[PDB]
Amino acid sequence: TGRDKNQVEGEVQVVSTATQSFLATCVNGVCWTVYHGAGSKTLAGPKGPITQMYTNVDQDLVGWQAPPGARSLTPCTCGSSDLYLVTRHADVIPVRRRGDSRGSLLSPRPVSYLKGSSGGPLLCPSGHAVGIFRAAVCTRGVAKAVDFVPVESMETTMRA
Ligand SMILES: C=C[C@@H]1C[C@]1(NC(=O)[C@@H]1C[C@@H]2CN1C(=O)[C@H](C1CCCC1)NC(=O)O[C@@H]1CCC[C@H]1CCCCCc1nc3ccccc3cc1O2)C(=O)NS(=O)(=O)C1CC1
Ligand SMILES: [Zn+2]
């Protein structure tokens, strides 16, 4: 009951910087984004200037803490090998699971086609999320496999 648009996904947000543009995902009431994108330099959001609360160059994980009361996604708890990757253009593609942090792409495409989609959260067909996109893997510019961080790893950083 009511009128609304773009109801396909509500846990995915879009953010653009002065020289780079990536996306962020709300997980466990905490917004997570890629660190190589923002980097040490801070970035102004919708509320205004903010300070990075979580940082990790080795894990390429960074984000901010949000207040409770907002819907959040959960880790995958159904052993779903097939996962869908969210792209900046709202595209959907099935990906086979070939490792905890590394997988294989069904359709081989150039890095440029999959460029500008960092932060795209991967959600299994059950509805739960497995992690977020981090870096693309290619031999001569063609991406055949993809690497992403699991949600469990993010929890370890938040605890510390
Ligand atoms: C195709 C899209 C990918 C998501 C994406 N990430 C990337 O492009 C990452 C960041 C760089 C190199 N890179 C890749 O994935 C490369 C590509 C091979 C040809 C072009 C580069 N492959 C690449 O390493 O492949 C290796 C092969 C084995 C697995 C994979 C491991 C790489 C992990 C390191 C990624 C990375 N992390 C950082 C953390 C902190 C500070 C700086 C970092 C810089 C990093 O790198 C991206 O779009 N990044 S972005 O900054 O433009 C953001 C705005 C969207
Ligand atoms: Zn699931």
According to DSSP, residue 61 is labeled E
1-73 adopts what CATH topology? Thrombin, subunit H (2.40.10)
Check 103, 118, 119, 120 and give the catalytic one.
118
Check 116, 128, 147, 153 and give the catalytic one.
116
DSSP E strand stretches across 11-93: 12-16, 21-27, 30-34, 61-65, 83-85
Question: Distance from the CA of 114 to the center of ligand 1, in angstroms?
Answer: 11
Q: Which residue's alpha carbon is at the smallest distance from atom 2 of ligand 1?
A: 115
Closest CA to 155 of 124, 135, 129: 129
Residue 115, helix vs strand vs coil: coil
* Catalytic residue list contains 36: yes
Question: Distance from the CA of 96 to the center of ligand 2, in angstroms?
Answer: 13
- 1-73 and 74-158 share one fold: yes
Ligand 1 contacts CB of residue 50 (under 6 A) = no
Domain made up of 74-158: CATH architecture: Beta Barrel (2.40)
Q: Where are the domains of the chain?
A: 1-73, 74-158
* Catalytic residue list contains 91: no
Q: Which residue's alpha carbon is at the smallest distance from atom 21 of ligand 1?
A: 136
Question: Distance from the CA of 12 to the center of ligand 2, in angstroms?
Answer: 17
Measured between alpha carbons, how far is 94 from 125 in angstroms, rounded to an integer?
Answer: 9
Measured between alpha carbons, how far is 121 from 23 in angstroms, rounded to an integer?
Answer: 9
According to DSSP, residue 112 is labeled T
Q: Which residue's alpha carbon is at the smallest distance from atom 11 of ligand 1?
A: 135
Residue type, 127: G
Q: Determine the straight-line distance between the first and last CA of the chain, rounded to whole angstroms.
A: 43
Both tokens of 66, joined, read: 């949000």
